[PDB]
A paper describes a structure:
Protein Tyrosine Phosphatase 1B ([name]) is the prototypical protein tyrosine phosphatase and plays an essential role in the regulation of several kinase-driven signalling pathways. Here we identify [name] as an inhibitor of IL-6 and show that, in vitro, it can dephosphorylate all four members of the [name] family. Dephosphorylation of substrate is initiated by nucleophilic attack by the active-site cysteine (Cys215) to form a phosphoenzyme intermediate followed by hydrolysis of the cysteinyl-phosphate to release free phosphate. Asp181 acts as both a proton donor, enabling protonation of the tyrosyl leaving group, and as a proton acceptor, receiving a proton from the water molecule that hydrolyzes the phosphoenzyme intermediate.
Interestingly, the [name]/[name] mutant exists in two states in the apo-form. The majority of the apo-protein has a Tm of 70 °C (similar to the substrate bound form of the triple mutant), whilst the minor species has a Tm of 55 °C. Titration of substrate leads to a progressive increase in the Tm of the minor species until it all exists in the Tm = 70 °C state. To better understand the interesting thermal shift profile of the [name]/[name] double mutant, we solved its crystal structure in both apo- and substrate-bound forms. The apo structure was similar to the apo structure of wild-type [name] (PDB: 2CM226) with the one notable exception that the WPD loop (which closes over the top of a substrate tyrosine) was already in its closed position. Although the WPD loop is usually closed when a substrate is bound, it is noteworthy that the previously determined [name] [name] structure (PDB 1A5Y25) also shows the loop in the closed state. It is possible that a preference for being in the closed position, even in apo form, explains the hyper-stable apo-species seen in the thermal shift profile of the [name]/[name] double mutant. The reason for the extremely slow off-rate compared to C215A alone is unclear, however we note that incorporation of the [name]/[name] mutations seem to stabilise the WPD-loop in a closed conformation, in which F182 may restrict exit of the tyrosine from the active site. This preference for the closed conformation can be seen in the structure of the [name] mutant alone. Likewise, the WPD-loop open conformation is stabilised by an interaction between Arg112 and Asp181 (PDB 2CM226), an interaction that is also not possible in the double or triple mutant.
Residue numbers in the entry: 1 to 298
The structure:
């Protein structure tokens, strides 16, 4: 309600750009010394997107423990996320090492491998059952088990094997294929339909490690996804939509990784998604079916 009131006031004042810039100005600035070491230059996709030292994920290797990935630990909401860049051709083994070591069950990919004529992410998972991937540097094997292809997203079941111990784990890969870089989803319905698909899988459950979320830089689309999820979880705990301060939650998230939410319209969309999702949180379970229809997933 208060969230809806502010939305209307910002929309009427046409002040989303000013609100968004205020977030950028107030956001945390912490050191990223490890990310900027010369030996790690080729492990970073973007010069101006780096993990803070205090929240970076460490690989459990003695050689070089660096990956461009951050642990977003939301204490009040009691949920954690790992946000990371789209893997590079030389960091795909590191990426799956992180998934293994952090005990994650789900990977959420919000970008395509090719966007706007450029390569934004390595092809880090297998596309055919019979052509598995072996990451020799990290001693992992990855096999495609099945895939459920919808109109604007695909869910894949993967098997990740630790070749050292022969232990295997099911990984669920949620690929949103129609969300443009520096853009927004087609509608709140299409976004929420996808988010609750991830939730229903158990990939966000506290009995698993943190879900891994990435786009190309791991801040814009990735930040929008986690902001909406965290706001809806906070609302769920109290059944109180007016108790959720979206800008305060975003500033809290930005303590753990820089640059979350990359445009003013992504911030506006985050409000829209949370305002619409509140319908389900506050007890209208039928709205989930409506989102599925409006998403045209079939």
């Amino acid at each position: 309600m208060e969230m809806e009131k502010e939305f209307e006031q910002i929309d009427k004042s046409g002040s989303w750009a000013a609100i968004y810039q205020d977030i950028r100005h107030e956001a945390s600035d912490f050191p990223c010394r490890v990310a900027k070491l010369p030996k790690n230059k080729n492990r970073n996709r973007y010069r101006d997107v780096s993990p803070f030292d205090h929240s970076r994920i460490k690989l459990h290797e003695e050689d070089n423990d660096y990956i461009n990935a951050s642990l977003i630990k939301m204490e009040e909401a009691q949920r954690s996320y790992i946000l990371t860049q789209g893997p590079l051709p030389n960091t795909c083994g590191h990426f799956w090492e992180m998934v293994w070591e952090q005990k994650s069950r789900g990977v959420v990919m919000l970008n395509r491998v090719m966007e706007k004529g450029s390569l934004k992410c390595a092809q880090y998972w297998p596309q055919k059952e019979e052509k598995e991937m072996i990451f020799e540097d990290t001693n992992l094997k990855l096999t495609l088990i099945s895939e459920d292809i919808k109109s604007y997203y695909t869910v894949r079941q993967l098997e990740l094997e630790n070749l050292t111990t022969q232990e295997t784990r099911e990984i669920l890969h949620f690929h949103y294929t129609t969300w443009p870089a520096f853009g927004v989803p087609e509608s709140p319905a299409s976004f929420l339909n996808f988010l609750f698909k991830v939730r229903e899988s158990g990939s966000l459950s506290p009995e698993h490690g943190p879900v891994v979320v990435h786009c190309s830089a791991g801040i814009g689309r990735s930040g929008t996804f986690c902001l909406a999820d965290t706001c809806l979880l906070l609302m769920d705990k109290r059944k109180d939509p007016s108790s959720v301060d979206i800008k305060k939650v975003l500033l809290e998230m930005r303590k753990f990784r820089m640059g979350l939410i990359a445009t003013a319209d992504q911030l506006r969309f985050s409000y829209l998604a949370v305002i619409e999702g509140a319908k389900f949180i506050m007890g209208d379970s039928s709205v989930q079916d409506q989102w599925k229809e409006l998403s045209h997933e079939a």
